[PDB]
Design a protein around this ligand. Structure first.
Ligand SMILES: CC1(C)O[C@@H]2[C@@H](CO[C@@]3(CNS(N)(=O)=O)OC(C)(C)O[C@@H]23)O1
Ligand SMILES: [Hg+2]
Ligand SMILES: [Zn+2]
Length: 256
């Protein structure tokens, strides 16, 4: 099945999921000189105060921190979004080296990693129905570079030991995703897709301009995770990012 290697990676995905070559695929390169300030964009509202994390899971591609999305606790609204989007989970994409790892790029620049905070449009009742809608999801994207430690990330780092291999999960309650944010909420936005199979074209992407910095030791711990299950040959979980896809006449709008 699908992964990120030579034989099952981004270049093969289209065979099982023809939408891979679709009209609004993600990620994309953000050409900063072609992006335009949009005065019609409302203030962005990230409201994570009452967020209820549940567990962390190595799903064989990355690790997911999942949240209780059974009420309006952690929600995204404003910016390009109409209505209320509920936080369901977050995950990262990272590289084998610091000069690669992000999915979106900024004037072709690749960051060390990218954090995706995944939200679903509450007018659709559940996540599963949302992903049948052109405006079903909103993903907040945050670039990571290597510098000083991100204190709000350490609790995630410290648990990766426990979820090394595919299928492993750990309790991960009382984690506050507010500690993963940069100070500015300046962003670019464009309509796009899930960056993994089934590559559904259901996402409003909101990609923050300001990266967070994480330490070299924090990134190294991401890179110790495994793509394989327990008792199988070791395949380090690195380079689990899809490259930039054709913009196809979409417009990337800037909030700033
Ligand atoms: C870690 C990874 C790749 O991302 C997780 C899961 C499968 O895909 C996602 C969405 N991926 S993304 N990158 O936000 O478009 O869709 C769901 C919501 C199923 O979980 C996300 O595994
Ligand atoms: Hg869709
Ligand atoms: Zn992602």
């Amino acid at each position: 099945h699908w992964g990120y290697g030579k034989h099952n990676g981004p270049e093969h995905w289209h065979k099982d999921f023809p939408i891979a070559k679709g009209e609004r695929q993600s990620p994309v390169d953000i050409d900063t000189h072609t992006a335009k300030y949009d005065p019609s964009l409302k203030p962005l509202s990230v409201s994570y105060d009452q967020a209820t994390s549940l567990r962390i899971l190595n799903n064989g591609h990355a690790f997911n921190v999942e949240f209780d999305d059974s009420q309006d606790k952690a929600v995204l609204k404003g910016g390009p979004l109409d209505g209320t989007y509920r936080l369901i989970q977050f995950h990262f994409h990272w590289g084998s080296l610091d000069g690669q790892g992000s999915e979106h790029t900024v004037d072709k620049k690749k960051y060390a990693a990218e954090l995706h905070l995944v939200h679903w449009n509450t007018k659709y009742g559940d996540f599963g129905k949302a992903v049948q809608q052109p405006d079903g999801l909103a993903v907040l994207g945050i670039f990571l570079k290597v510098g000083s430690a991100k204190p709000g990330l350490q609790k995630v780092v410290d648990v990766l030991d426990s979820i090394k291999t595919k299928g492993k999960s750990a309790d991960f309650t009382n984690f506050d995703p507010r500690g993963l944010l940069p100070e500015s909420l300046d962003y670019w936005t464009y309509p796009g897709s899930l960056t993994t199979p089934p590559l559904l074209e259901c996402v409003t992407w909101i990609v923050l301009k300001e990266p967070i910095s994480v330490s070299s030791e924090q990134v190294l711990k991401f890179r110790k995770l495994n793509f394989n299950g327990e008792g199988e040959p070791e395949e380090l979980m690195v380079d689990n990012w899809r490259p930039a896809q054709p913009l196809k006449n979409r417009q990337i709008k800037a909030s700033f």
